[PDB]
Amino acid sequence: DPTLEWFLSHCHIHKYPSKSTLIHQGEKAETLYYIVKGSVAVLIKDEEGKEMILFYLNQGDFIGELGLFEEGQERSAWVRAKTACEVAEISYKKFRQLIQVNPDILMRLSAQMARRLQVTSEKVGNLAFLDVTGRIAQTLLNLAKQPDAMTHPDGMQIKITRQEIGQIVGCSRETVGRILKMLEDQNLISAHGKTIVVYG
Amino acid sequence: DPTLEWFLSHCHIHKYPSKSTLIHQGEKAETLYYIVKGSVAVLIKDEEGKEMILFYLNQGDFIGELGLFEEGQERSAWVRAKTACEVAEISYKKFRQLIQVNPDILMRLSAQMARRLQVTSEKVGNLAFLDVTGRIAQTLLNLAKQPDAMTHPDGMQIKITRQEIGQIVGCSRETVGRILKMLEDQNLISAHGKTIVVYG
Ligand SMILES: Nc1ncnc2c1ncn2[C@@H]1O[C@@H]2COP(=O)(O)O[C@H]2[C@H]1O
Ligand SMILES: Nc1ncnc2c1ncn2[C@@H]1O[C@@H]2COP(=O)(O)O[C@H]2[C@H]1O
């Protein structure tokens, strides 16, 4: 991918250990990132410091793009390393020059923005239309749809903690545990340690 | 704006009467739109066909952009004229050519995508974190912030139906009615037929 190589040749790459915060909500935005290796969580917080996970981003994803198109923006969310990460960084002004040179790099970034808006909109609908059981169920389905989900003779299998499910749906880890027990009883799912099979 | 004029010279413009649906969820996406005049609502539905309003778009806004960056996409939402509209239309293929010619047109589109993702993310946090009252109240404030809100000696005045407020916050028209009554009692707002005076 010559496009990617050319873009990256203009970035400076930095390593972030698991759990480190790459981006703090409210900081002034002047730089774009790209995940060469690793995975991160994008999250927001309520007034009680409870975190919610808006998105998981991985190798190939841009981050910190939302301040690119208007100056004086603040970072709209926190971004925290789930794994150890290699992350390329580049100033907004330099990136703008790259765009004038070859707009395919902006098309790639924008393609990701479009996907993120589609998925985030779906999350709005889930939060507004479903009760807690429905939200948890739909989250299990969505995770069953991820590339890293592994086939199972009963359905599709995923790994994730009660805590993480809770951070995605907006509930406590306890509530999540009770609801997963129910879905197991209704023979819709199966549970293990940190492994779940979704029947479908 | 010469960049906008240039762009428009490549579009074909069409008129849509109030209430007409410009875009149906699920259609195959191959064309981009731009609102020369008028305003529209972007909405989604539950399985029972209740509608929720994700966004209001106006003169200057692109629409139907989400299918641009990958082929074989379906329209992610319904878009319906709130007023009568003049809307420019152009094939994705042709728009891609325009981008190669002058990427500023893609920068404009992408600036809107970025704003939409920021605001939609905030909506996720509101649904997750606030109760129907914090939500209804905040919605009243937001509408009080709109350019079409008219000054009042008590505060700022807006017009909108219980039904519409409910479609924005994700609750029934009845629930909305009861909550507005409460906010009237707490002397935070005043009500009329389809008119509300947000105090302060
Ligand atoms: N809803 C979302 N979906 C995916 N990524 C997001 C979302 N909201 C914020 N982000 C990412 O969080 C980043 C942190 O700061 P920025 O606002 O500069 O750019 C942001 C986006 O890259
Ligand atoms: N969350 C949103 N905020 C603003 N506009 C949206 C949102 N979700 C969908 N739209 C618009 O609805 C359009 C309908 O089809 P597209 O998916 O082609 O492109 C879409 C966007 O223009």
Swiss-Prot record, chains A, B:
Additional observations: Binds 2 cAMP; cAMP 1 is in the anti conformation, while cAMP 2 is in the syn conformation.
Induction section of the entry: Constitutively expressed, levels decrease in stationary phase; more strongly induced in an rnlA deletion mutant, levels remain high even in stationary phase (at protein level). Both positively and negatively autoregulated.
Regulation: In the apo-form the DNA-binding helices form a rigid body in which their DNA recognitions helices are buried. cAMP binding causes a coil-to-helix transition, stabilizing the active DNA binding conformation by reorienting and elongating these helices, which precludes a return to the inactive state. Interaction with SpfP blocks activation of some, but not all, CRP-dependent genes.
Effect of I105L: In strain CA8404; a CAP* phenotype, insensitive to catabolite repression
Assembly, per entry: Homodimer, which upon binding cAMP is able to bind DNA. AR1 of the upstream subunit binds to the C-terminus of RNAP subunit RpoA, AR2 of the downstream subunit binds to the N-terminus of RpoA while AR3 binds to sigma-70 (rpoD). Interacts with SpfP.
SUPFAM superfamilies with a match to the protein in the record: cAMP-binding domain-like, Winged helix' DNA-binding domain
Region (Activating region 1 (AR1)): 146-155
Positions with a binding annotation for 3',5'-cyclic AMP 1: G49, K50, E51, M52, I53, L54, F55, G64, E65, L66, R75, S76, T120, S121
Mutant lacking the gene: phenotype: Not essential (on rich medium), greatly increased levels of cAMP. Eliminates the NaCl sensitivity of an rnlA deletion mutant.
Phenotype when changing R173K: Suppresses DNA-binding
PROSITE patterns: CNMP_BINDING_1, CNMP_BINDING_2, CNMP_BINDING_3, HTH_CRP_1, HTH_CRP_2
Biological role stated in the UniProt entry: A global transcription regulator, which plays a major role in carbon catabolite repression (CCR) as well as other processes. Binds cyclic AMP (cAMP) which allosterically activates DNA binding (to consensus sequence 5'-AAATGTGATCTAGATCACATTT-3') to directly regulate the transcription of about 300 genes in about 200 operons and indirectly regulate the expression of about half the genome. Among the targets of CRP is the spf gene which encodes the dual-function sRNA Spot 42; spf expression is repressed by CRP. Spot 42 base pairs with and represses expression from a number of mRNAs encoding proteins involved in the uptake and catabolism of nonpreferred carbon sources. CRP and Spot 42 coregulate at least 14 operons involved in cellular metabolism, forming a coherent feedforward loop. Interaction with SpfP, encoded within the Spot 42 RNA, reinforces this feedforward loop.
Protein name: DNA-binding transcriptional dual regulator CRP
Record annotation: effect of changing R178K: No modification of DNA-binding
Name of a matching Pfam family: HTH_Crp_2
Annotated region described as Activating region 2 (AR2), given as residue ranges: 12-14
Organism in which the protein naturally occurs: Escherichia coli (strain K12)
